[PDB]
Amino acid sequence: GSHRQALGERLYPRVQAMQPAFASKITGMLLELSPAQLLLLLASEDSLRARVEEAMELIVA
């Protein structure tokens, strides 16, 4: 969708800074969260880190 793409564009380099190799996969996963959780991700470095690591071990297990 047009809106989730804009979200994804803002989120992507931030995820890439922490997971250069899986940024595309992780961003797409992240974009399935509730609006509320997405907002929090945008607003909060620490909150995003938590989701990114969450996403990481869902992938590797």
Partner: peptide
């Protein structure tokens, strides 16, 4: 709930 089946995202 995070989802290994989500589509991959593609920047521009």
């Amino acid at each position: 709930k995070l989802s290994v089946n989500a589509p991959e995202f593609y920047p521009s």
